[PDB]
Design a protein around this motif. Structure first.
Motif, PDB file in Angstrom:
ATOM      1  N   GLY A   1     -19.376  11.988   5.547  1.00 18.15           N
ATOM      2  CA  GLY A   1     -20.484  11.586   6.386  1.00 18.15           C
ATOM      3  C   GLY A   1     -21.823  12.102   5.923  1.00 18.15           C
ATOM      4  N   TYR A   2     -21.871  12.734   4.757  1.00 20.89           N
ATOM      5  CA  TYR A   2     -23.101  13.242   4.177  1.00 20.89           C
ATOM      6  C   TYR A   2     -23.439  12.429   2.943  1.00 20.89           C
ATOM      7  N   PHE A   3     -24.600  11.797   2.961  1.00 13.66           N
ATOM      8  CA  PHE A   3     -25.133  11.109   1.803  1.00 13.66           C
ATOM      9  C   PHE A   3     -26.043  12.099   1.094  1.00 13.66           C
ATOM     10  N   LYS A   4     -25.590  12.574  -0.053  1.00 10.42           N
ATOM     11  CA  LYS A   4     -26.278  13.591  -0.822  1.00 10.42           C
ATOM     12  C   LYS A   4     -26.990  12.903  -1.974  1.00 10.42           C
ATOM     13  N   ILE A   5     -28.285  13.165  -2.093  1.00 12.24           N
ATOM     14  CA  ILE A   5     -29.115  12.626  -3.155  1.00 12.24           C
ATOM     15  C   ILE A   5     -29.553  13.795  -4.017  1.00 12.24           C
ATOM     16  N   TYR A   6     -29.155  13.769  -5.281  1.00 10.09           N
ATOM     17  CA  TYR A   6     -29.696  14.675  -6.281  1.00 10.09           C
ATOM     18  C   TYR A   6     -30.678  13.892  -7.138  1.00 10.09           C
ATOM     19  N   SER A   7     -31.682  14.583  -7.666  1.00  7.51           N
ATOM     20  CA  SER A   7     -32.687  13.901  -8.464  1.00  7.51           C
ATOM     21  C   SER A   7     -33.142  14.800  -9.603  1.00  7.51           C
ATOM     22  N   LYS A   8     -33.678  14.156 -10.636  1.00  8.29           N
ATOM     23  CA  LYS A   8     -34.211  14.839 -11.804  1.00  8.29           C
ATOM     24  C   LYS A   8     -35.271  13.944 -12.428  1.00  8.29           C
TER      25      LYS A   8
ATOM     26  N   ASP B   1     -29.599  16.249   1.492  1.00  7.78           N
ATOM     27  CA  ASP B   1     -28.335  15.825   2.069  1.00  7.78           C
ATOM     28  C   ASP B   1     -28.619  15.312   3.469  1.00  7.78           C
ATOM     29  N   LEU B   2     -28.218  14.074   3.730  1.00 11.37           N
ATOM     30  CA  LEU B   2     -28.484  13.420   4.982  1.00 11.37           C
ATOM     31  C   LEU B   2     -27.161  13.079   5.641  1.00 11.37           C
ATOM     32  N   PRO B   3     -26.830  13.693   6.776  1.00  9.95           N
ATOM     33  CA  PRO B   3     -25.569  13.347   7.446  1.00  9.95           C
ATOM     34  C   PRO B   3     -25.667  12.026   8.199  1.00  9.95           C
ATOM     35  N   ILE B   4     -25.873  10.949   7.439  1.00  7.97           N
ATOM     36  CA  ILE B   4     -25.991   9.622   8.035  1.00  7.97           C
ATOM     37  C   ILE B   4     -24.670   9.218   8.670  1.00  7.97           C
ATOM     38  N   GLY B   5     -23.553   9.550   8.022  1.00  7.31           N
ATOM     39  CA  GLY B   5     -22.252   9.233   8.575  1.00  7.31           C
ATOM     40  C   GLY B   5     -22.002   7.744   8.717  1.00  7.31           C
ATOM     41  N   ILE B   6     -22.305   6.980   7.667  1.00  2.00           N
ATOM     42  CA  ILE B   6     -22.027   5.552   7.628  1.00  2.00           C
ATOM     43  C   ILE B   6     -21.204   5.258   6.383  1.00  2.00           C
ATOM     44  N   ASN B   7     -20.478   4.146   6.432  1.00  2.00           N
ATOM     45  CA  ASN B   7     -19.678   3.700   5.303  1.00  2.00           C
ATOM     46  C   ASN B   7     -20.529   2.839   4.380  1.00  2.00           C
ATOM     47  N   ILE B   8     -20.418   3.094   3.079  1.00  2.00           N
ATOM     48  CA  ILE B   8     -21.201   2.394   2.069  1.00  2.00           C
ATOM     49  C   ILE B   8     -20.252   1.837   1.020  1.00  2.00           C
ATOM     50  N   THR B   9     -20.449   0.568   0.661  1.00  6.44           N
ATOM     51  CA  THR B   9     -19.667  -0.076  -0.382  1.00  6.44           C
ATOM     52  C   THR B   9     -20.518  -0.834  -1.389  1.00  6.44           C
TER      53      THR B   9
ATOM     54  N   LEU C   1     -25.588  14.306  20.107  1.00  5.85           N
ATOM     55  CA  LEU C   1     -24.884  13.152  19.570  1.00  5.85           C
ATOM     56  C   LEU C   1     -23.996  13.594  18.415  1.00  5.85           C
ATOM     57  N   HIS C   2     -23.271  12.633  17.842  1.00  3.92           N
ATOM     58  CA  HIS C   2     -22.506  12.883  16.621  1.00  3.92           C
ATOM     59  C   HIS C   2     -23.435  12.786  15.414  1.00  3.92           C
ATOM     60  N   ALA C   3     -24.492  13.575  15.490  1.00  2.50           N
ATOM     61  CA  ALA C   3     -25.590  13.554  14.544  1.00  2.50           C
ATOM     62  C   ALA C   3     -26.036  14.995  14.367  1.00  2.50           C
TER      63      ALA C   3
END
Lengths: 48, 122, 108, 49
Positions: free
Chosen positions: A1-8, A30-38, D20-22
């Motif tokens: 549930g964490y979308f982690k972005i590293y950059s350089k 790191d953003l705990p967006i908690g969404i599914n990505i495909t 929330l769940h956030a």
């Protein structure tokens, strides 16, 4: 549930092609967006 | 309680009419009561002039507000009234009364004073 | 504007009867009303507050029909010393503390 | 000012906590304590005990 972005960011003098070398990508956020990505798509700027 | 009026009984036209009401049955510094002035011309109806609270502020009539002011003095336990630019239509009996405003629209004059007759003429 | 209209200007009744004074406000807000009595040469005396509450020292024969826009003061048993001028008084937002035109009660 | 206490104005502030769940974005000061050096202490830095 964490979308982690590293950059350089580097200055590359090569004119074409992916450079050959090593560079570590530090975490950017790191953003705990908690969404599914495909899938994803890139966005570019348009110069009028 | 009792309220007693005091002031000159004659005021020339276009001059300030000053009156002072002195109470002695209680306290004017009480935070439960207003002190107001109500005038009536001879043979006419009642007209509330203005009511003052103990702190400093007061509210007056929407017609006499320009040429009217009220003051209070807790030390002497009395409140005064000034009516600037008195015309001949101010010839009336002025009472000073005790007001109780508990909810919003409940505004009654509990005990009235006897009142003094001020006749404005030249 | 919230205008006060009392009725009637003069009321002719004899002792022993009951009097009914009307104090209607304009087609406007509704809340409380005060009734006062004034005899010749005397300061007006508070009769009723909060649209029906007998003041300190008012006989039981006085009553108020505290209802909508129109209000009514009722005197059950007219005594000889109950004939005077009666004023109804409101306290609206603007103008504050409006007074009625007054009803003169005399002996027929 | 001439009203009873029941009719006098009262200013009311209601604090509600939306959980929330956030990620939590609001936390307590966590009892900021002074720093002590050169002495055997039980330390806790950013949750690391």
């Amino acid at each position: 549930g964490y979308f982690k972005i590293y950059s350089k960011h580097t200055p590359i003098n090569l004119v074409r092609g992916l450079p050959q070398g090593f560079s570590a990508l530090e975490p950017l956020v790191d953003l705990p967006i908690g969404i599914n990505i495909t899938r994803f798509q890139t966005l570019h700027i348009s110069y009028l | 309680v009792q309220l007693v009026e005091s002031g000159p009984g004659l005021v020339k036209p276009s001059e300030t009419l000053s009156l002072t009401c002195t109470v002695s049955g209680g306290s004017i510094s009480s935070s439960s009561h207003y002190w107001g002035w109500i005038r009536q011309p001879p043979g006419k109806g009642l007209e509330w002039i203005g009511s003052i609270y103990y702190s400093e502020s007061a509210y007056y009539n929407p017609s006499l507000k320009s040429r009217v002011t009220m003051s209070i003095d807790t030390s002497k336990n009395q409140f005064s009234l000034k009516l600037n630019s008195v015309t001949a239509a101010d010839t009336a009996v002025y009472y000073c009364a005790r007001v109780t405003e508990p909810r919003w629209t409940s505004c009654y004059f509990d005990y009235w004073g006897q009142g003094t007759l001020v006749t404005v003429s030249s | 504007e919230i205008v006060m209209t009392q009725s009637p200007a003069t009321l002719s009744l004899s002792p022993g009867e009951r009097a009914t004074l009307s104090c209607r406000t304009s087609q406007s807000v509704t809340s409380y009303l005060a009734w006062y009595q004034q005899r010749p040469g005397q300061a007006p005396r508070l009769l009723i507050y909060d649209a029906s509450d007998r003041a300190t020292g008012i006989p039981a024969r006085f009553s108020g029909s505290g209802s909508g826009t129109d209000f009514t003061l009722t005197i059950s048993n007219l005594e000889p010393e109950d004939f005077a001028v009666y004023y109804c008084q409101l306290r609206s937002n603007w103008p504050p503390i409006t007074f009625g035109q007054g009803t003169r009660l005399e002996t027929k | 000012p001439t009203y009873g206490v029941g009719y006098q104005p009262y200013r009311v502030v209601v604090l509600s906590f939306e959980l929330l769940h956030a990620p939590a974005t609001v936390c307590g000061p966590k009892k900021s304590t002074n720093l002590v050096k050169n002495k055997c202490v039980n330390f806790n830095f950013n949750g690391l005990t």
